[PDB]
Each structure stands twice: as C-alpha cells, then as structure tokens.
C-alpha cells in the first residue's frame, strides 16, 4: 500500500524452492542402486511401475524412475540420473538415464531413441 510502508519494508519476492535437489542444480548426478522396487501408481492409474532407490554421489538417498520397457539393472548397478518427476508414483522426482554408465538402452526401440539411450540401429 503506502509508499511510506514500503520504505520500512520493501516488497520481498518469494524464494522458489527447486522441485529436485539433484544437489547444486547439477544437470544430473551419479548414483548406485540401493534397491530396485516396482510399485503401483495413484488413484486414476494402474500398472506396475519400474523404479529404484539411489544412493547418490552427493550422498542423498532419493529414488528414481527407470523409464522404458525392460531394463537390466539391479542391486549395485551404478547409474546416472536426471531431473524428472513422475506424477503418479509418489516420491519419484528423478529418472534413470537409459544408456548411461551401467544403465542399458532399451531393447528394440526405433522411434525416439535418444531418450531411452538406444543407438541408431546399423541400418
């Protein structure tokens, strides 16, 4: 309201919290697979989703989606993971980077290979 007021207390901008502590906003951090669940989605959806706990390079113990159809990942697998929540599974604010370190590209994929880590099939 009153300029006066504003001089005592200037207008202060809300400080955004990031929606993903991939610590120091790193475009993606390295992890090792604590465990490899598969759970079920929320209210409207229904499927067995494939995920995994990750003990990061920066020692956070958050959890991660393994996208795609079929992954050869397990206990101990070192992955890389990027920012990307999965609004369906709760407490899944990251994706596993297919074709990164131990992570596998997806068998047989043809469209949209670069996501899902799959090499342009020797044509």
């Amino acid at each position: 309201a009153t300029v006066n007021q504003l001089v005592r207390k200037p207008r202060a901008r809300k400080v955004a919290k990031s929606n993903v502590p991939a610590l120091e906003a790193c475009p993606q951090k390295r992890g090792v697979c604590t465990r490899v669940y598969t759970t079920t989605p929320k209210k409207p959806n229904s499927a067995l989703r494939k995920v995994c706990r990750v003990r990061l390079t920066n020692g956070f113990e958050v959890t991660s989606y393994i996208g795609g159809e079929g992954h050869n990942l397990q206990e101990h697998s070192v992955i890389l993971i990027r920012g990307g929540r999965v609004k369906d599974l709760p407490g899944v604010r990251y994706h596993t980077v297919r074709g990164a370190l131990d992570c596998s590209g997806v068998k047989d994929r043809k469209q949209a290979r670069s996501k899902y880590g799959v090499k342009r099939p020797k044509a």
Partner: protein, 183 residues
C-alpha cells in the same frame, strides 16, 4: 492334567520354532535357495498358484537362480511375479528360462538383514515363552482345586522350563545357521 499339558506345550513350541525357521528361508540370502522363490505367487489362468507349481527352480550358481517354466506361455506372467513379489529381484529372460541373479552382498544389507533376523529370532523366543506362560498358568491353577501335590507342581513347571530352553536352543541354532550366511 499335567501329562496332557506337557504335550500341548512341546507342540505349541515346536510350532513356534518351525514358523521361525520358515520366515527365515524367506529372506534374501548370501546364496541362492529356492525356498523363497517358492512362496512367490503367479497369475495362472485367473487362479493364483505358487510359482513352485508352474516351474522348476534350480540353483544355476551361488548367486543366480534358473526357473524352468514347464508351460512356455506363462513364462511372461511368471517373470512379472518375480518383480511383483517386490523382493528387489530383477528377472532377465533369455530362451525358455528366467535367470534371477542373486545380488552381491553389500555392507548396508548384511546389517539391514542380520538386525531383521536377530529380531525375528527374538520375536520367536517370545512366542515360545508365551507358551511357557500358559503352561504354568494351567498348572498353577490345578494347584487350588487341590488336584496336584505342591510337589507335582514344582516338578512340572520344570519340564516346561526344559521344553522352553529346548525350543529356544533350536531357535538359536537356526538363527546361527543363517547368521553364517549373512556374514
């Protein structure tokens, strides 16, 4: 009468241990062991049916199981069960046979597990003991209604002790067996 109650206790208690021993075999070990892979349930033409009944379980080695699914069509449904038993298990398909690698054994885990195990043991001793407790209760109570000599009474309560110590030492053999694995 006393002689009746000793029966009922030996029994109740053996039940206790055996039920321990079972929860035990359902735990991700150092090695393989089809015992856990059994319990798993598979969707078998609408009727659920333990995987044990649809496929054979080998130890393809220390740290990897091999599930020969007699019926090849169910193969995909079987595999899904291994991932749906949520047991941290990844079932890699490859030609008429589902390979289930057994993990290596980390530190986080060994701890994780032993503490779980030791505490399942102690829940167990607790069951055993509860039987100690009804046992003596029954007898204790056959003291009034003077149906038992104060002598009779001491004596028996002692057999119950004997029974309880025994059931326990079993329980601890078991625990030790496993503790060997985890370590």
């Amino acid at each position: 009468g006393i002689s009746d109650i000793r029966k009922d206790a030996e029994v109740r208690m053996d039940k206790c241990v055996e039920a321990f021993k079972t929860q035990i075999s359902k735990i991700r070990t150092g090695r393989a062991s089809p015992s856990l892979l059994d319990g798993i349930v598979v969707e078998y033409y609408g009727t659920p049916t333990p995987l044990r009944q649809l496929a054979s379980v080998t130890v393809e080695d220390s740290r990897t199981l091999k599930i020969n699914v007699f019926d090849r069509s169910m193969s995909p449904a079987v595999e899904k069960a291994i991932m749906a038993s949520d047991l941290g298990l990844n079932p890699n398909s490859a030609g008429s046979d589902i390979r289930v690698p057994l993990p290596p054994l980390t530190e986080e885990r060994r701890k994780d597990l032993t503490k779980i195990v030791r505490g399942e043991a102690e829940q167990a001793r607790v069951a055993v003991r509860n039987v100690r407790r009804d046992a003596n209760d029954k007898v204790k109570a056959l003291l009034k209604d003077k149906e038992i000599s104060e002598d009779d009474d001491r004596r028996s309560q002692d057999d119950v002790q004997k029974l309880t110590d025994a059931a326990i030492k079993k329980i601890e053999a078991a625990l030790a067996d496993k503790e060997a694995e985890l370590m």
